[PDB]
Amino acid sequence: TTLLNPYFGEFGGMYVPQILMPALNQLEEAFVSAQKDPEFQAQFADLLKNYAGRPTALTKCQNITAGTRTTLYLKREDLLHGGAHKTNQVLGQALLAKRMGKSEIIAETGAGQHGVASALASALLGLKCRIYMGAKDVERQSPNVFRMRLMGAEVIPVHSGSATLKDACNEALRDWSGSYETAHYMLGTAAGPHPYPTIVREFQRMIGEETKAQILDKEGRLPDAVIACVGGGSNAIGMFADFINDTSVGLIGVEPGGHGIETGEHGAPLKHGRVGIYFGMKAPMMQTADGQIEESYSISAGLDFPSVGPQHAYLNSIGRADYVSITDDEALEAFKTLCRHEGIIPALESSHALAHALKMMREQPEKEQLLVVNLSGRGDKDIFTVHDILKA
Amino acid sequence: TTLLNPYFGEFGGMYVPQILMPALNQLEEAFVSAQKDPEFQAQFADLLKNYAGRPTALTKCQNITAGTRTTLYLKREDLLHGGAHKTNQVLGQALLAKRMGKSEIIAETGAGQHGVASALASALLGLKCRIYMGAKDVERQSPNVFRMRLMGAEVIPVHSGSATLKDACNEALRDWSGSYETAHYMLGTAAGPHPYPTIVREFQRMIGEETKAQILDKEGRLPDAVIACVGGGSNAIGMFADFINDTSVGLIGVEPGGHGIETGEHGAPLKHGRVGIYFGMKAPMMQTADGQIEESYSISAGLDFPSVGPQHAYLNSIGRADYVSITDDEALEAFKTLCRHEGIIPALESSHALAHALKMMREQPEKEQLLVVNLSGRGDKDIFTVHDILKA
Amino acid sequence: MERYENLFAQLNDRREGAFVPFVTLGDPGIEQSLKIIDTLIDAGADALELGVPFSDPLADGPTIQNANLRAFAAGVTPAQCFEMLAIIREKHPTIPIGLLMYANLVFNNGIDAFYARCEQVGVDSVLVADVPVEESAPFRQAALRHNIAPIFICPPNADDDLLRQVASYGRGYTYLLSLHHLIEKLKEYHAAPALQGFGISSPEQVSAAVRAGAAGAISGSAIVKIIEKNLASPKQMLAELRSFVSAMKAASRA
Amino acid sequence: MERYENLFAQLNDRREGAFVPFVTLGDPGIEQSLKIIDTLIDAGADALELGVPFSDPLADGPTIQNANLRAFAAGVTPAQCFEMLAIIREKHPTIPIGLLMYANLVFNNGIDAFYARCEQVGVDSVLVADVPVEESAPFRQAALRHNIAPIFICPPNADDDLLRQVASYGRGYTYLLSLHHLIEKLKEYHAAPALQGFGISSPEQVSAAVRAGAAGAISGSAIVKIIEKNLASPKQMLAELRSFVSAMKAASRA
Ligand SMILES: O=P(O)(O)OCCCc1c[nH]c2ccccc12
Ligand SMILES: O=P(O)(O)OCCCc1c[nH]c2ccccc12
Ligand SMILES: *Cc1c(COP(=O)(O)O)cnc(C)c1O
Ligand SMILES: *Cc1c(COP(=O)(O)O)cnc(C)c1O
Ligand code: NA
Ligand code: NA
């Protein structure tokens, strides 16, 4: 039994070993309680404002759209403390862990942004943090690994399986199965077993709420579409949530097309995978014809989650949101364009969302449209990657 | 003749070759005009808010001060677009350049933060930007150099002299002497010839104005002291300005002590240099007994300006502000402490200011005091430096 | 078929506990794995619990995680596992055979098709490690339609409602994960006989499980370690597996 | 002393322009620099403009920047420069000697002390490159008290107020940086005789400056380049300096 619906249509659920169910039920109950607690809401709002820097700006990009009938705004999650939207939800989950009397945090991370965010939230809130990271990811993210250690977190390399994000995801679950009494598993995206998709969306929903108030203030109307990259689905569902009931607002999720969908080397399970059951949920997955889970490929390390949040699969199924893909080269071109024309270095993740907005604009330049791209993070971290590619 | 006083007591002035005086007078006149122009003020406020992310948060640091009678807040310039306070004033100077009908920007940079900020402001505002950087600095700041190029700026290595910041400063002036008709020299700190010390302070003064409103809101009184690192003096004078007439508020500037004042390897000309005339002003300088200008040394690349803003020398002389120094090791310890206890990675520049606040707290733990440290920038850029040192 | 029912009836007639080893199919290769399984049976295994290698065995400890990797290194696929299962059943008609599966491999090409394939090759039960009772409906329904026993784990804590669900939903045997109260309650609610599992690695643990009221004990990591330890010597591997299983099974006898 | 006044009177009696080379003291070494200066004089220099190496010559172009670096590489200090200046004056009693200084080197140990040292060694003028008329008061006052001519640059544009200030404030000569209107106005306001400078590198430029009404021409980069070009051959260096100065001075004659 649960207090909230674990499914979005056919997607979602709680596909975890029996031993983990009490942890999920405990978390769901604490969450429902926290959401009705004005004190919890005030403490969360306070950290978001005074520690993380909310609200984040909504920046109009006139130089990029000059000569077309597209008006483009960027929701500036790149200006959030930590440099990405991940910070919002780790602060809420950290407060939930404390609400449950937990003193420890367990987290998984691929590119390391979630590890960094979990570590910073744990440092601020006095939680003892341990992070699982696939050894291949550890190897290629030494900067993020060192930040986690400076912040007091223990980083544990995972060598099992492919030694990447999904393997770290399995190890986090394994750990929690036996330590949930004193540790909270701080899941990094709007995926996994209920109640995580729900919790993560609610702790990222201020992105869309602010965007709505900011766009109404600046344009006196809602956007024609809000566009966000989709790795696991948290920044996108955070931007989409408050607009779901505004039927006129398009919700466009952008998955990584990698070297191109036809190459098979991509990270677009929602539109090009097959529904499966893994990581505690039923959702579209990157998997072999046999049912073995595979990695997502993208020039962007952070769009590496091999599945997608169940609410996105659901919004897609009913036609409420549309999902598309953007290739590595398209994302790189958008990264370059934003740097040169607006002086903003976007994360390569976010660059996928920008790349799709640029296509909407460039393909029909005389189409009048008000677009908001969720700039989920800053791209300082991608400078070396982009440099080498350009050097190549 | 000038519209405004070029001096702060005996310090300041316009010590430039005759050929550059018309450029300084033109700039001063445009500045005075802009400051009275409500439209210029609105355009500047708009970019600061919607593009740069102002106001920045004022974060209370309870974990750092636990057990003492010190209450410490950090003014979060690290959350400003670009990651440091430099962004504020480059946007104002870029708008001034446009007010004067200039289409090009010239800038100098040491550690590269100012180059990056000048490049981003130029990209946003459609100015053609060229940056001078000493070749030794180019060599050790390839990440910042590449960001400047991604943003469309031309980066010009300076091999003359010591091939560092002061040499780039000389080359910027040289260039401008012949191009001021169409180019604006975007000076990077509150130093150099009038009107720059004045302009830079006014375009950074929102730091202190916001801090004052935020601290009054949160504590109902002014701080006992505001503390800021002093490289050239811009972030410090930006924090200090609005408090100058609040006699009860201490203004503490922190210069880099490097390996220790007694070693001579430091960057504390205000308290340990000798007044000289260079870079267009009369001010305390790092110089030989003979009068040759020397480099400032600090573990922090950004506290490399070999002199200090004339207004700081003046505030020091009359006893309105107090200047102290913090060594490399003290700054590193503060960097570590903030990361571990608040989950904020501070710039090593800013870490000097934090290190001094920590000393004020630790030395007299039962002294009741409300302190604000200007966290002038984020420290992602210093992770490698700190790592190697700790590895060493 | 009623292989588990028949087994437990026979064991009860002999006041004997069941000893059930677990191995990963195809670890360290198909041929060696088939020899390992025949050795476990000849050595006295009463039933078998067999894992199909899955890419993300999030309910498995290091030892089994490594067995999955060895099987994958050998190219083992679920299809090959089902080929092995038919060969195993063809050689051993009465031993109960239970699969330890991950949900995706069951759901992949259709839940009903999966249980139909299990029935076709002669498997007797399926324990889907990541399907709690709350999500088990389609799985147990399909299992029951194809005469496959759906196995459920009764966790260490397990409140009363859970014990009642596990007793109602499962068949064949109840997997008792890491005591007397859990066992008495399972019996009270007429649950399938309990097989105790989780770290069983010595004979005294097998005798203690039987003394506690469990119908037997499952041992996997202890078995898999022997494979891991003797990879360079297949003959020694089989000799050590025989010795260990013989000892563990002896401990289950009255 | 009145060396500039005497020089210009003599040159005027001969309807002749002044040719004034500039070199950096101590470039490429003290000994070679003293030989270079004697060669410039023997070759026909009417006066000398001499730079004291400074760490941050922000008013200097690349050629002179490099001369400063060579002098520093040789360990040249302002003190050594003043030692050279006394030796130069001791050998040449009437040639006007002007220093090209940066403000810090003048202000360093006291502005008045600096001009007192200039007077002691026999220097005739000082042009502080980074001191505009607006900040010149202490410098020109100290210069005048020690019988040193303070030299000011009249920039290409220079409005009327500036021409009037330069005419009133300067002595010795007016440095005319990069025309007829500037020259006529300087004469109208009774400014010190104008020496045209900035890129003068050929004889025709010297004759043109004199034709335009200037009292002479200053050439520095063109001279310093000859030093730069012949570093490996000091003898050839001096021969080429002699040839160039002789040509430039010939162009100034009626
Ligand atoms: O001896 P042990 O502790 O390794 O138990 C091995 C039991 C069979 C077994 C292997 N992998 C699993 C995942 C979930 C439940 C049971 C299993
Ligand atoms: O021949 P040119 O163009 O190098 O002029 C050389 C004039 C002497 C000279 C050398 N460095 C200076 C700085 C300011 C004003 C004049 C000078
Ligand atoms: C982690 C990351 C993402 C991908 O995760 P989502 O859960 O899909 O939002 C997107 N943008 C940035 C900058 C990230 O760090
Ligand atoms: C450049 C820099 C400084 C030093 O310059 P000031 O003009 O003294 O403020 C201080 N902090 C940061 C983060 C900087 O980038
Ligand atoms: Na994905
Ligand atoms: Na300084």
mmCIF file with all atom_site columns, N, CA and C in Angstrom, chain A residues 7 13-18 21 160 166-167 170 174 180 274-278 282 287 289-293, chain C residues 53-60 65 72 77-78 103-105 107-108 129-130 132-135 155 157:
data_model
loop_
_atom_site.group_PDB
_atom_site.id
_atom_site.type_symbol
_atom_site.label_atom_id
_atom_site.label_alt_id
_atom_site.label_comp_id
_atom_site.label_asym_id
_atom_site.label_entity_id
_atom_site.label_seq_id
_atom_site.pdbx_PDB_ins_code
_atom_site.Cartn_x
_atom_site.Cartn_y
_atom_site.Cartn_z
_atom_site.occupancy
_atom_site.B_iso_or_equiv
_atom_site.pdbx_formal_charge
_atom_site.auth_seq_id
_atom_site.auth_comp_id
_atom_site.auth_asym_id
_atom_site.auth_atom_id
_atom_site.pdbx_PDB_model_num
ATOM 1   N N  . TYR A 1 7   ? 2.527  5.110   -9.873  1.00 0.00 ? 7   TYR A N  1
ATOM 2   C CA . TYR A 1 7   ? 2.575  5.040   -11.343 1.00 0.00 ? 7   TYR A CA 1
ATOM 3   C C  . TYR A 1 7   ? 2.091  6.284   -12.063 1.00 0.00 ? 7   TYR A C  1
ATOM 4   N N  . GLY A 1 13  ? 6.246  2.675   -10.580 1.00 0.00 ? 13  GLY A N  1
ATOM 5   C CA . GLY A 1 13  ? 6.231  1.524   -9.698  1.00 0.00 ? 13  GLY A CA 1
ATOM 6   C C  . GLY A 1 13  ? 7.365  1.518   -8.660  1.00 0.00 ? 13  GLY A C  1
ATOM 7   N N  . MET A 1 14  ? 7.424  0.372   -7.959  1.00 0.00 ? 14  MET A N  1
ATOM 8   C CA . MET A 1 14  ? 8.388  0.152   -6.891  1.00 0.00 ? 14  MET A CA 1
ATOM 9   C C  . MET A 1 14  ? 9.000  -1.213  -7.073  1.00 0.00 ? 14  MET A C  1
ATOM 10  N N  . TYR A 1 15  ? 9.828  -1.358  -8.111  1.00 0.00 ? 15  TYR A N  1
ATOM 11  C CA . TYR A 1 15  ? 10.430 -2.663  -8.396  1.00 0.00 ? 15  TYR A CA 1
ATOM 12  C C  . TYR A 1 15  ? 11.748 -2.883  -7.682  1.00 0.00 ? 15  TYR A C  1
ATOM 13  N N  . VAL A 1 16  ? 11.637 -3.008  -6.374  1.00 0.00 ? 16  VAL A N  1
ATOM 14  C CA . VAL A 1 16  ? 12.799 -3.235  -5.558  1.00 0.00 ? 16  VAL A CA 1
ATOM 15  C C  . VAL A 1 16  ? 12.626 -4.508  -4.752  1.00 0.00 ? 16  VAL A C  1
ATOM 16  N N  . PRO A 1 17  ? 13.757 -5.075  -4.316  1.00 0.00 ? 17  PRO A N  1
ATOM 17  C CA . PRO A 1 17  ? 13.697 -6.284  -3.498  1.00 0.00 ? 17  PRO A CA 1
ATOM 18  C C  . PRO A 1 17  ? 12.822 -5.937  -2.283  1.00 0.00 ? 17  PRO A C  1
ATOM 19  N N  . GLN A 1 18  ? 12.105 -6.938  -1.787  1.00 0.00 ? 18  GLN A N  1
ATOM 20  C CA . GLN A 1 18  ? 11.223 -6.769  -0.672  1.00 0.00 ? 18  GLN A CA 1
ATOM 21  C C  . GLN A 1 18  ? 11.847 -6.011  0.507   1.00 0.00 ? 18  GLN A C  1
ATOM 22  N N  . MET A 1 21  ? 11.355 -2.270  0.567   1.00 0.00 ? 21  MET A N  1
ATOM 23  C CA . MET A 1 21  ? 10.073 -1.601  0.581   1.00 0.00 ? 21  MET A CA 1
ATOM 24  C C  . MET A 1 21  ? 9.809  -0.754  1.818   1.00 0.00 ? 21  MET A C  1
ATOM 25  N N  . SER A 1 160 ? 31.869 -2.973  -10.533 1.00 0.00 ? 160 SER A N  1
ATOM 26  C CA . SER A 1 160 ? 30.929 -3.962  -11.067 1.00 0.00 ? 160 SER A CA 1
ATOM 27  C C  . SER A 1 160 ? 30.291 -3.481  -12.356 1.00 0.00 ? 160 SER A C  1
ATOM 28  N N  . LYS A 1 166 ? 24.784 3.433   -14.108 1.00 0.00 ? 166 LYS A N  1
ATOM 29  C CA . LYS A 1 166 ? 23.827 2.411   -13.713 1.00 0.00 ? 166 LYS A CA 1
ATOM 30  C C  . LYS A 1 166 ? 24.394 1.476   -12.638 1.00 0.00 ? 166 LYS A C  1
ATOM 31  N N  . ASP A 1 167 ? 25.698 1.205   -12.689 1.00 0.00 ? 167 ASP A N  1
ATOM 32  C CA . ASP A 1 167 ? 26.337 0.313   -11.707 1.00 0.00 ? 167 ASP A CA 1
ATOM 33  C C  . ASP A 1 167 ? 26.404 0.992   -10.349 1.00 0.00 ? 167 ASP A C  1
ATOM 34  N N  . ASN A 1 170 ? 23.000 0.727   -8.866  1.00 0.00 ? 170 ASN A N  1
ATOM 35  C CA . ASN A 1 170 ? 22.771 -0.585  -8.223  1.00 0.00 ? 170 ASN A CA 1
ATOM 36  C C  . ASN A 1 170 ? 23.452 -0.663  -6.862  1.00 0.00 ? 170 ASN A C  1
ATOM 37  N N  . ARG A 1 174 ? 21.874 -1.238  -3.106  1.00 0.00 ? 174 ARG A N  1
ATOM 38  C CA . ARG A 1 174 ? 22.398 -2.325  -2.279  1.00 0.00 ? 174 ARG A CA 1
ATOM 39  C C  . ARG A 1 174 ? 22.779 -1.861  -0.886  1.00 0.00 ? 174 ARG A C  1
ATOM 40  N N  . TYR A 1 180 ? 19.274 1.755   5.548   1.00 0.00 ? 180 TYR A N  1
ATOM 41  C CA . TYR A 1 180 ? 18.191 2.731   5.540   1.00 0.00 ? 180 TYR A CA 1
ATOM 42  C C  . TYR A 1 180 ? 17.703 3.219   6.906   1.00 0.00 ? 180 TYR A C  1
ATOM 43  N N  . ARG A 1 274 ? 13.105 0.744   -25.322 1.00 0.00 ? 274 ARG A N  1
ATOM 44  C CA . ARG A 1 274 ? 12.006 -0.206  -25.187 1.00 0.00 ? 274 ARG A CA 1
ATOM 45  C C  . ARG A 1 274 ? 11.704 -0.246  -23.697 1.00 0.00 ? 274 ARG A C  1
ATOM 46  N N  . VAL A 1 275 ? 10.427 -0.267  -23.352 1.00 0.00 ? 275 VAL A N  1
ATOM 47  C CA . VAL A 1 275 ? 10.052 -0.326  -21.939 1.00 0.00 ? 275 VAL A CA 1
ATOM 48  C C  . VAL A 1 275 ? 10.619 -1.597  -21.297 1.00 0.00 ? 275 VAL A C  1
ATOM 49  N N  . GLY A 1 276 ? 11.188 -1.414  -20.116 1.00 0.00 ? 276 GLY A N  1
ATOM 50  C CA . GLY A 1 276 ? 11.730 -2.526  -19.362 1.00 0.00 ? 276 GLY A CA 1
ATOM 51  C C  . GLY A 1 276 ? 11.541 -2.232  -17.886 1.00 0.00 ? 276 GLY A C  1
ATOM 52  N N  . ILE A 1 277 ? 12.111 -3.074  -17.031 1.00 0.00 ? 277 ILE A N  1
ATOM 53  C CA . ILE A 1 277 ? 11.999 -2.835  -15.597 1.00 0.00 ? 277 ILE A CA 1
ATOM 54  C C  . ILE A 1 277 ? 13.401 -2.891  -15.034 1.00 0.00 ? 277 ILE A C  1
ATOM 55  N N  . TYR A 1 278 ? 13.835 -1.782  -14.473 1.00 0.00 ? 278 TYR A N  1
ATOM 56  C CA . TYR A 1 278 ? 15.148 -1.713  -13.891 1.00 0.00 ? 278 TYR A CA 1
ATOM 57  C C  . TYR A 1 278 ? 15.215 -0.464  -13.023 1.00 0.00 ? 278 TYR A C  1
ATOM 58  N N  . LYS A 1 282 ? 9.399  0.750   -14.019 1.00 0.00 ? 282 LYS A N  1
ATOM 59  C CA . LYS A 1 282 ? 9.051  0.313   -15.366 1.00 0.00 ? 282 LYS A CA 1
ATOM 60  C C  . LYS A 1 282 ? 9.119  1.609   -16.197 1.00 0.00 ? 282 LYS A C  1
ATOM 61  N N  . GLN A 1 287 ? 18.461 -0.909  -23.749 1.00 0.00 ? 287 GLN A N  1
ATOM 62  C CA . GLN A 1 287 ? 18.708 -2.326  -23.454 1.00 0.00 ? 287 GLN A CA 1
ATOM 63  C C  . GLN A 1 287 ? 18.913 -3.183  -24.704 1.00 0.00 ? 287 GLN A C  1
ATOM 64  N N  . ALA A 1 289 ? 18.380 -6.616  -27.138 1.00 0.00 ? 289 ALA A N  1
ATOM 65  C CA . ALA A 1 289 ? 17.152 -7.338  -27.525 1.00 0.00 ? 289 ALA A CA 1
ATOM 66  C C  . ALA A 1 289 ? 16.796 -8.441  -26.488 1.00 0.00 ? 289 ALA A C  1
ATOM 67  N N  . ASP A 1 290 ? 17.832 -8.845  -25.757 1.00 0.00 ? 290 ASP A N  1
ATOM 68  C CA . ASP A 1 290 ? 17.821 -9.872  -24.708 1.00 0.00 ? 290 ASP A CA 1
ATOM 69  C C  . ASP A 1 290 ? 17.336 -9.351  -23.366 1.00 0.00 ? 290 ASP A C  1
ATOM 70  N N  . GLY A 1 291 ? 17.412 -8.041  -23.173 1.00 0.00 ? 291 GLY A N  1
ATOM 71  C CA . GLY A 1 291 ? 16.968 -7.486  -21.913 1.00 0.00 ? 291 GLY A CA 1
ATOM 72  C C  . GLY A 1 291 ? 18.092 -7.094  -20.969 1.00 0.00 ? 291 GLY A C  1
ATOM 73  N N  . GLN A 1 292 ? 19.333 -6.996  -21.459 1.00 0.00 ? 292 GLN A N  1
ATOM 74  C CA . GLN A 1 292 ? 20.450 -6.577  -20.601 1.00 0.00 ? 292 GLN A CA 1
ATOM 75  C C  . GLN A 1 292 ? 20.469 -5.047  -20.697 1.00 0.00 ? 292 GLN A C  1
ATOM 76  N N  . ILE A 1 293 ? 20.715 -4.358  -19.598 1.00 0.00 ? 293 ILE A N  1
ATOM 77  C CA . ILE A 1 293 ? 20.715 -2.885  -19.626 1.00 0.00 ? 293 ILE A CA 1
ATOM 78  C C  . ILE A 1 293 ? 22.032 -2.353  -20.226 1.00 0.00 ? 293 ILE A C  1
ATOM 79  N N  . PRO C 2 53  ? 22.363 -14.830 -15.749 1.00 0.00 ? 53  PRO C N  1
ATOM 80  C CA . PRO C 2 53  ? 23.175 -13.610 -15.732 1.00 0.00 ? 53  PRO C CA 1
ATOM 81  C C  . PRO C 2 53  ? 22.414 -12.403 -16.246 1.00 0.00 ? 53  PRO C C  1
ATOM 82  N N  . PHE C 2 54  ? 22.437 -11.348 -15.440 1.00 0.00 ? 54  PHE C N  1
ATOM 83  C CA . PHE C 2 54  ? 21.786 -10.087 -15.767 1.00 0.00 ? 54  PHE C CA 1
ATOM 84  C C  . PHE C 2 54  ? 22.807 -8.965  -15.566 1.00 0.00 ? 54  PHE C C  1
ATOM 85  N N  . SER C 2 55  ? 22.716 -7.965  -16.431 1.00 0.00 ? 55  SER C N  1
ATOM 86  C CA . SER C 2 55  ? 23.640 -6.844  -16.400 1.00 0.00 ? 55  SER C CA 1
ATOM 87  C C  . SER C 2 55  ? 23.630 -6.044  -15.107 1.00 0.00 ? 55  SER C C  1
ATOM 88  N N  . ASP C 2 56  ? 22.472 -5.956  -14.451 1.00 0.00 ? 56  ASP C N  1
ATOM 89  C CA . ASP C 2 56  ? 22.367 -5.130  -13.246 1.00 0.00 ? 56  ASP C CA 1
ATOM 90  C C  . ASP C 2 56  ? 21.653 -5.803  -12.096 1.00 0.00 ? 56  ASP C C  1
ATOM 91  N N  . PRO C 2 57  ? 22.304 -6.815  -11.496 1.00 0.00 ? 57  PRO C N  1
ATOM 92  C CA . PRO C 2 57  ? 21.825 -7.631  -10.379 1.00 0.00 ? 57  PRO C CA 1
ATOM 93  C C  . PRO C 2 57  ? 21.911 -6.830  -9.089  1.00 0.00 ? 57  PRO C C  1
ATOM 94  N N  . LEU C 2 58  ? 21.073 -5.805  -8.993  1.00 0.00 ? 58  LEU C N  1
ATOM 95  C CA . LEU C 2 58  ? 21.092 -4.926  -7.820  1.00 0.00 ? 58  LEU C CA 1
ATOM 96  C C  . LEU C 2 58  ? 20.696 -5.550  -6.482  1.00 0.00 ? 58  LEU C C  1
ATOM 97  N N  . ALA C 2 59  ? 20.310 -6.826  -6.471  1.00 0.00 ? 59  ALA C N  1
ATOM 98  C CA . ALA C 2 59  ? 19.964 -7.517  -5.229  1.00 0.00 ? 59  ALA C CA 1
ATOM 99  C C  . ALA C 2 59  ? 21.075 -8.524  -4.876  1.00 0.00 ? 59  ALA C C  1
ATOM 100 N N  . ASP C 2 60  ? 22.127 -8.547  -5.687  1.00 0.00 ? 60  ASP C N  1
ATOM 101 C CA . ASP C 2 60  ? 23.215 -9.472  -5.448  1.00 0.00 ? 60  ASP C CA 1
ATOM 102 C C  . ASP C 2 60  ? 24.437 -8.902  -4.804  1.00 0.00 ? 60  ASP C C  1
ATOM 103 N N  . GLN C 2 65  ? 27.779 -11.109 -8.017  1.00 0.00 ? 65  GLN C N  1
ATOM 104 C CA . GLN C 2 65  ? 28.041 -10.098 -9.042  1.00 0.00 ? 65  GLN C CA 1
ATOM 105 C C  . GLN C 2 65  ? 29.196 -10.595 -9.898  1.00 0.00 ? 65  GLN C C  1
ATOM 106 N N  . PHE C 2 72  ? 29.069 -13.631 -18.266 1.00 0.00 ? 72  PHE C N  1
ATOM 107 C CA . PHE C 2 72  ? 29.006 -12.721 -19.397 1.00 0.00 ? 72  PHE C CA 1
ATOM 108 C C  . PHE C 2 72  ? 30.299 -12.773 -20.192 1.00 0.00 ? 72  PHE C C  1
ATOM 109 N N  . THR C 2 77  ? 23.929 -16.027 -22.434 1.00 0.00 ? 77  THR C N  1
ATOM 110 C CA . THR C 2 77  ? 22.711 -15.255 -22.690 1.00 0.00 ? 77  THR C CA 1
ATOM 111 C C  . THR C 2 77  ? 21.543 -16.015 -22.063 1.00 0.00 ? 77  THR C C  1
ATOM 112 N N  . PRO C 2 78  ? 20.390 -15.348 -21.882 1.00 0.00 ? 78  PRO C N  1
ATOM 113 C CA . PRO C 2 78  ? 19.261 -16.073 -21.296 1.00 0.00 ? 78  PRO C CA 1
ATOM 114 C C  . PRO C 2 78  ? 18.866 -17.264 -22.166 1.00 0.00 ? 78  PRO C C  1
ATOM 115 N N  . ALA C 2 103 ? 13.615 -8.814  -12.869 1.00 0.00 ? 103 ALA C N  1
ATOM 116 C CA . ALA C 2 103 ? 12.374 -8.480  -13.558 1.00 0.00 ? 103 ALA C CA 1
ATOM 117 C C  . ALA C 2 103 ? 12.491 -8.204  -15.023 1.00 0.00 ? 103 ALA C C  1
ATOM 118 N N  . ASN C 2 104 ? 13.506 -7.439  -15.416 1.00 0.00 ? 104 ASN C N  1
ATOM 119 C CA . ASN C 2 104 ? 13.587 -7.155  -16.835 1.00 0.00 ? 104 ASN C CA 1
ATOM 120 C C  . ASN C 2 104 ? 13.688 -8.394  -17.717 1.00 0.00 ? 104 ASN C C  1
ATOM 121 N N  . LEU C 2 105 ? 14.433 -9.403  -17.259 1.00 0.00 ? 105 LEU C N  1
ATOM 122 C CA . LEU C 2 105 ? 14.553 -10.604 -18.079 1.00 0.00 ? 105 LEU C CA 1
ATOM 123 C C  . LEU C 2 105 ? 13.255 -11.397 -18.164 1.00 0.00 ? 105 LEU C C  1
ATOM 124 N N  . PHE C 2 107 ? 10.130 -9.737  -17.913 1.00 0.00 ? 107 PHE C N  1
ATOM 125 C CA . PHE C 2 107 ? 9.205  -8.857  -18.604 1.00 0.00 ? 107 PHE C CA 1
ATOM 126 C C  . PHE C 2 107 ? 9.546  -8.620  -20.073 1.00 0.00 ? 107 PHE C C  1
ATOM 127 N N  . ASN C 2 108 ? 10.838 -8.653  -20.355 1.00 0.00 ? 108 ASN C N  1
ATOM 128 C CA . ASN C 2 108 ? 11.401 -8.362  -21.668 1.00 0.00 ? 108 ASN C CA 1
ATOM 129 C C  . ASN C 2 108 ? 10.599 -8.745  -22.882 1.00 0.00 ? 108 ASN C C  1
ATOM 130 N N  . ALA C 2 129 ? 13.945 -11.315 -8.103  1.00 0.00 ? 129 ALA C N  1
ATOM 131 C CA . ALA C 2 129 ? 14.575 -10.602 -6.987  1.00 0.00 ? 129 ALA C CA 1
ATOM 132 C C  . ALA C 2 129 ? 14.090 -9.180  -6.723  1.00 0.00 ? 129 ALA C C  1
ATOM 133 N N  . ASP C 2 130 ? 13.746 -8.470  -7.788  1.00 0.00 ? 130 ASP C N  1
ATOM 134 C CA . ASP C 2 130 ? 13.304 -7.085  -7.691  1.00 0.00 ? 130 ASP C CA 1
ATOM 135 C C  . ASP C 2 130 ? 11.836 -6.815  -7.911  1.00 0.00 ? 130 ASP C C  1
ATOM 136 N N  . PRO C 2 132 ? 8.697  -6.945  -5.519  1.00 0.00 ? 132 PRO C N  1
ATOM 137 C CA . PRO C 2 132 ? 8.141  -7.129  -4.172  1.00 0.00 ? 132 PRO C CA 1
ATOM 138 C C  . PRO C 2 132 ? 6.700  -7.613  -4.291  1.00 0.00 ? 132 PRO C C  1
ATOM 139 N N  . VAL C 2 133 ? 6.123  -8.087  -3.190  1.00 0.00 ? 133 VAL C N  1
ATOM 140 C CA . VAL C 2 133 ? 4.746  -8.584  -3.327  1.00 0.00 ? 133 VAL C CA 1
ATOM 141 C C  . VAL C 2 133 ? 3.816  -7.537  -3.911  1.00 0.00 ? 133 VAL C C  1
ATOM 142 N N  . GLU C 2 134 ? 4.066  -6.286  -3.569  1.00 0.00 ? 134 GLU C N  1
ATOM 143 C CA . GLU C 2 134 ? 3.241  -5.201  -4.064  1.00 0.00 ? 134 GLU C CA 1
ATOM 144 C C  . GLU C 2 134 ? 3.157  -5.097  -5.581  1.00 0.00 ? 134 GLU C C  1
ATOM 145 N N  . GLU C 2 135 ? 4.193  -5.530  -6.294  1.00 0.00 ? 135 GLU C N  1
ATOM 146 C CA . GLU C 2 135 ? 4.202  -5.434  -7.755  1.00 0.00 ? 135 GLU C CA 1
ATOM 147 C C  . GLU C 2 135 ? 4.119  -6.825  -8.366  1.00 0.00 ? 135 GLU C C  1
ATOM 148 N N  . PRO C 2 155 ? 11.509 -11.040 4.221   1.00 0.00 ? 155 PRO C N  1
ATOM 149 C CA . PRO C 2 155 ? 12.624 -10.301 4.813   1.00 0.00 ? 155 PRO C CA 1
ATOM 150 C C  . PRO C 2 155 ? 12.663 -10.470 6.315   1.00 0.00 ? 155 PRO C C  1
ATOM 151 N N  . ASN C 2 157 ? 12.653 -8.479  8.890   1.00 0.00 ? 157 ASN C N  1
ATOM 152 C CA . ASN C 2 157 ? 11.640 -7.773  9.656   1.00 0.00 ? 157 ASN C CA 1
ATOM 153 C C  . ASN C 2 157 ? 10.240 -8.287  9.318   1.00 0.00 ? 157 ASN C C  1
#
